[PDB]
Enzyme design. Structure first.
Site, PDB file in Angstrom:
ATOM      1  N   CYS B 179      43.747  18.488  38.414  1.00 31.22           N
ATOM      2  CA  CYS B 179      44.668  17.398  38.758  1.00 31.22           C
ATOM      3  C   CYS B 179      44.423  16.105  37.984  1.00 31.22           C
ATOM      4  O   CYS B 179      45.197  15.157  38.097  1.00 31.22           O
ATOM      5  CB  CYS B 179      44.579  17.065  40.253  1.00 31.22           C
ATOM      6  SG  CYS B 179      44.595  18.478  41.387  1.00 31.22           S
ATOM      7  N   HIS B 320      46.075   8.141  43.915  1.00 33.69           N
ATOM      8  CA  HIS B 320      46.235   9.553  43.641  1.00 33.69           C
ATOM      9  C   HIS B 320      46.864  10.262  44.852  1.00 33.69           C
ATOM     10  O   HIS B 320      47.597  11.235  44.689  1.00 33.69           O
ATOM     11  CB  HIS B 320      44.873  10.176  43.299  1.00 33.69           C
ATOM     12  CG  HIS B 320      44.937  11.643  42.999  1.00 33.69           C
ATOM     13  ND1 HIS B 320      45.591  12.152  41.897  1.00 33.69           N
ATOM     14  CD2 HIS B 320      44.463  12.711  43.683  1.00 33.69           C
ATOM     15  CE1 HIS B 320      45.521  13.473  41.919  1.00 33.69           C
ATOM     16  NE2 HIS B 320      44.842  13.837  42.992  1.00 33.69           N
ATOM     17  N   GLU B 331      40.588   8.331  49.691  1.00 32.37           N
ATOM     18  CA  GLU B 331      40.950   7.366  48.651  1.00 32.37           C
ATOM     19  C   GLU B 331      41.263   5.989  49.249  1.00 32.37           C
ATOM     20  O   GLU B 331      40.963   4.964  48.640  1.00 32.37           O
ATOM     21  CB  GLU B 331      42.142   7.873  47.820  1.00 32.37           C
ATOM     22  CG  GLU B 331      42.669   6.836  46.822  1.00 32.37           C
ATOM     23  CD  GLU B 331      43.642   7.412  45.802  1.00 32.37           C
ATOM     24  OE1 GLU B 331      44.482   8.269  46.176  1.00 32.37           O
ATOM     25  OE2 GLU B 331      43.581   6.985  44.627  1.00 32.37           O
ATOM     26  N   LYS B 354      53.719  10.208  44.568  1.00 33.37           N
ATOM     27  CA  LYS B 354      53.849  11.649  44.770  1.00 33.37           C
ATOM     28  C   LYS B 354      54.796  12.011  45.913  1.00 33.37           C
ATOM     29  O   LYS B 354      55.170  13.173  46.072  1.00 33.37           O
ATOM     30  CB  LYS B 354      52.472  12.287  45.004  1.00 33.37           C
ATOM     31  CG  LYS B 354      51.550  12.259  43.778  1.00 33.37           C
ATOM     32  CD  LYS B 354      50.369  13.221  43.941  1.00 33.37           C
ATOM     33  CE  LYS B 354      49.543  13.342  42.658  1.00 33.37           C
ATOM     34  NZ  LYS B 354      48.853  12.069  42.315  1.00 33.37           N
ATOM     35  N   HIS B 359      53.357  16.557  43.538  1.00 31.51           N
ATOM     36  CA  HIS B 359      52.095  16.565  42.795  1.00 31.51           C
ATOM     37  C   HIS B 359      52.321  17.308  41.478  1.00 31.51           C
ATOM     38  O   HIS B 359      52.442  18.532  41.476  1.00 31.51           O
ATOM     39  CB  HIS B 359      51.016  17.288  43.603  1.00 31.51           C
ATOM     40  CG  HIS B 359      49.638  17.164  43.032  1.00 31.51           C
ATOM     41  ND1 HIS B 359      49.383  16.600  41.797  1.00 31.51           N
ATOM     42  CD2 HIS B 359      48.432  17.522  43.532  1.00 31.51           C
ATOM     43  CE1 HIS B 359      48.085  16.614  41.565  1.00 31.51           C
ATOM     44  NE2 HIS B 359      47.481  17.169  42.603  1.00 31.51           N
ATOM     45  N   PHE B 419      40.268  19.240  41.504  1.00 28.55           N
ATOM     46  CA  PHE B 419      39.318  20.192  42.059  1.00 28.55           C
ATOM     47  C   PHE B 419      38.044  20.160  41.239  1.00 28.55           C
ATOM     48  O   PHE B 419      38.083  19.938  40.030  1.00 28.55           O
ATOM     49  CB  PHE B 419      39.890  21.613  42.056  1.00 28.55           C
ATOM     50  CG  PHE B 419      40.879  21.875  43.154  1.00 28.55           C
ATOM     51  CD1 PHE B 419      41.318  23.172  43.411  1.00 28.55           C
ATOM     52  CD2 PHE B 419      41.372  20.833  43.934  1.00 28.55           C
ATOM     53  CE1 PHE B 419      42.235  23.427  44.430  1.00 28.55           C
ATOM     54  CE2 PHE B 419      42.289  21.079  44.956  1.00 28.55           C
ATOM     55  CZ  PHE B 419      42.721  22.381  45.203  1.00 28.55           C
TER      56      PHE B 419
END
Ligand SMILES: [K+]
Ligand SMILES: [K+]
Lengths: 431, 431
Positions: B179, B320, B331, B354, B359, B419
């Protein structure tokens, strides 16, 4: 800031571990063998399908990592003991552990951990796992689909597992550039240490793509050897007139890079300095390099310029040469353009080690950087296997090494060229 | 060496082109819709298997790029031409062409072409192609395997195609970090220009992984939204109390990075300067970030240190937040830790886009970097969509934007976490 190498680690078709791999390489051993049904990695398929699939493979040779609990062997019970850990990840962790212990860098303090990063990329990842999952769709058995499927196929996860295991919170990076992956991963890590993003980076490449679809895919691209299926040990012959494609190999190469002052302060033994990271693009063809090898010329030249060294100051070159008709000749041609007299006179020493290890793809650049660093460290340059009839471009003077010879090696350049015309050249020097 | 942005290009679920995407984004639009059998990309499968697969998918929502020959639409005839071009490659080339024409950078000179590189990575590649090939194994029809199979699945081919299209022979690189791929590809390009590897770099990210196995895989990992299948436009809700996983999106973001003096000499338009490229690793879990968000804190703090700016000097933060319970909260805590009083005053503007684009995975970091640049360029901060009930962590002062705010934006930070705990934070500022 200068960057040096203080740790080496690797798992290859010549054995698990740097010592064993290097000894066998120098002694002229070859890790290539004939394919079997087990090598298809199709355990979830019936025998009829395995037999059929095997027969559809034009290339039936490859270079495998030796598994086992004995010395010089890769122990899957030790490195592949998790559902989220694919083979390419396990190879990377295995190699990183050896490198870190070699550099004696297993910090417990947060500050040291925060200043240590990871950059180990994978070229393809795990096609085997994707094929197994795809079979679930074809047979309507998705209930079997594992939650670890996504995690284990992501090519950046090799770097993630290494950082998690040692608590490294510095840059968690991965460069993916096909056959140059290992080179760019080490190069980017070097740029990060230079800039100050980290003081220590564990970088390299890993690849485990020896399976049905991988072999069928590369074969369909006419990139693999098929002429020597009956004589595997003779399949990989870089620079030889009878070469007919590369032999797929697997494994991983990892090194510990760190800022010069940082290494000296703690009294770490330094193998060499990484002085050049030349990059370029062929901007020519998706799979074929330019006849003039301009891209290769640019990469090598850029690495030289960065190191402030002249062509005649390069003692050894570990060629990318994968045993491909066009590829090998283009690089030899580029080497002549870059080193001219220094090469045509025979002064320059150069060879390809893929005759012994095969083409490790994503890991090729890392493993070969290790060989280049070791040539400097030991003052021994590895031979090129199977060069029975040198390519017409070579002569009594300009010729690749056919025997491992002792010689002072203060500088070594390693080239990596991948699909899409992505080129990288790493230049190392004694310090 | 300073690095500025002189070109912007993108293809997203909000439209093809920066103009369209930005306009719709600011106007509070959404590109998410319900999945259908056709979206599975299972052309080679029968109906019975399509239905079975679709029925197994817990998440039936996604954000698609609008195809068509009309304005604001992606014309597959111009980009999805050759048989060696997978969707992620086409999107990248399309976005790059727009970015280059925007920057008016289509040099004919060998020197300029040699000093121009490409760094556009993909996070997954083309799963559907592998699934199709796999089906050939299950059905014993491997003779139908495409000779372009390998070139289509290599996640580095996007940079390869863009380079050969314009003759760019500078560094041909790709950063793959799940990502965060789009962010690292841009950051690595910045480092290269800073070091002198190139004067111009075409960087960003691309992704097109909306297919049977991609959706089934992410769903099985419990990472996707599943409670809003009947209300797609409500499925992605970053920072909202009812969030339940992200929505897979597709697209590409590409920008033109240029050395400052080189840009001024040719009188090029300058959007902003990229002043920070903070990287870090959580070294915690393969898919879950640490409760304290230390990784996120380190990435943001590092980009800040690099820029020489302090938290109170940051005007906009593009979070994010992918609409995940734990992720979004982590976050949020990280942002509060980094900006403290600047956040609790309510002055700091932050949001996640997003909710609108979904995403974009490998492209998320690049597309969102563009939004950050556009916020500075246009003086408008993008709203967060679907925040009906703000997470308990927020209050009257500390709250993400829920409306497009007209305001002076001198500096903008964009975070990308993937990830493996790989974190990147890009910081931009007007110049
Ligand atoms: K090499
Ligand atoms: K972001």
């Amino acid at each position: 800031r200068r960057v040096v190498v203080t740790g080496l680690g690797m798992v290859t078709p010549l054995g698990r571990g740097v010592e064993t791999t290097w000894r066998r390489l120098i002694d002229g051993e070859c890790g290539i063998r004939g394919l079997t049904l087990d090598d298809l990695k199709m355990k979830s398929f019936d025998e009829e399908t395995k037999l059929y699939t095997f027969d559809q493979l034009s290339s039936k040779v490859a270079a495998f990592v030796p598994y086992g609990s004995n010395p010089g062997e890769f122990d899957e019970a030790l490195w592949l003991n998790s559902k989220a850990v694919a083979n390419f990840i396990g190879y990377a962790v295995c190699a990183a552990d050896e490198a870190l212990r070699d550099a004696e860098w297993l910090p417990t303090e947060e500050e040291e951990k925060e200043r240590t990063g990871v950059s180990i990329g994978g070229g393809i990842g795990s096609i085997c796992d994707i094929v197994e999952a795809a079979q679930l769709i074809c047979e309507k058995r998705l209930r079997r689909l594992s939650p670890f499927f996504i995690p284990k196929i992501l090519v950046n996860m090799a770097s993630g597992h290494v950082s998690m295991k040692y608590g490294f919170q510095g840059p968690n990076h991965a460069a993916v550039t096909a056959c140059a992956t290992g080179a760019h991963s080490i190069g980017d890590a070097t740029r990060m240490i230079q800039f100050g993003d980290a003081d220590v980076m564990v970088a390299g490449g890993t690849e485990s793509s020896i399976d049905a679809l991988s072999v069928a895919g590369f074969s369909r691209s006419r990139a693999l050897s098929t002429k020597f299926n009956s004589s595997p040990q003779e399949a990989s012959r870089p620079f030889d007139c009878d070469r007919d494609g590369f032999v797929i190999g697997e494994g991983s190469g990892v090194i510990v890079l760190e800022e010069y002052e940082h290494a000296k302060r703690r009294g770490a033994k330094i193998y060499a300095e990484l002085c050049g990271y030349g990059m370029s693009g062929d901007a020519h063809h998706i799979t074929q390099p330019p006849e003039d090898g301009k891209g290769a010329v640019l990469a090598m030249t850029r690495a030289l310029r960065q190191s402030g060294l002249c062509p005649n100051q390069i003692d050894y070159v570990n060629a990318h040469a994968t045993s491909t008709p066009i590829g090998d000749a283009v690089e030899a041609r580029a080497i002549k353009t870059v080193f001219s007299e220094h090469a045509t006179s025979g002064t320059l020493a150069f060879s390809s080690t893929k005759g012994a290890t095969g083409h490790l793809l994503g890991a090729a650049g890392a493993v070969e950087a290790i060989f280049s660093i070791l040539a400097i460290h030991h003052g021994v340059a590895p031979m090129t296997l199977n060069v029975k009839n040198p390519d017409p471009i070579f002569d009594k003077r300009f010729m690749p090494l056919t025997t491992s010879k002792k010689m002072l090696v203060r500088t070594a350049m390693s080239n990596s060229f991948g699909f899409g015309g992505t080129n990288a050249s790493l230049l190392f020097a004694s310090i």
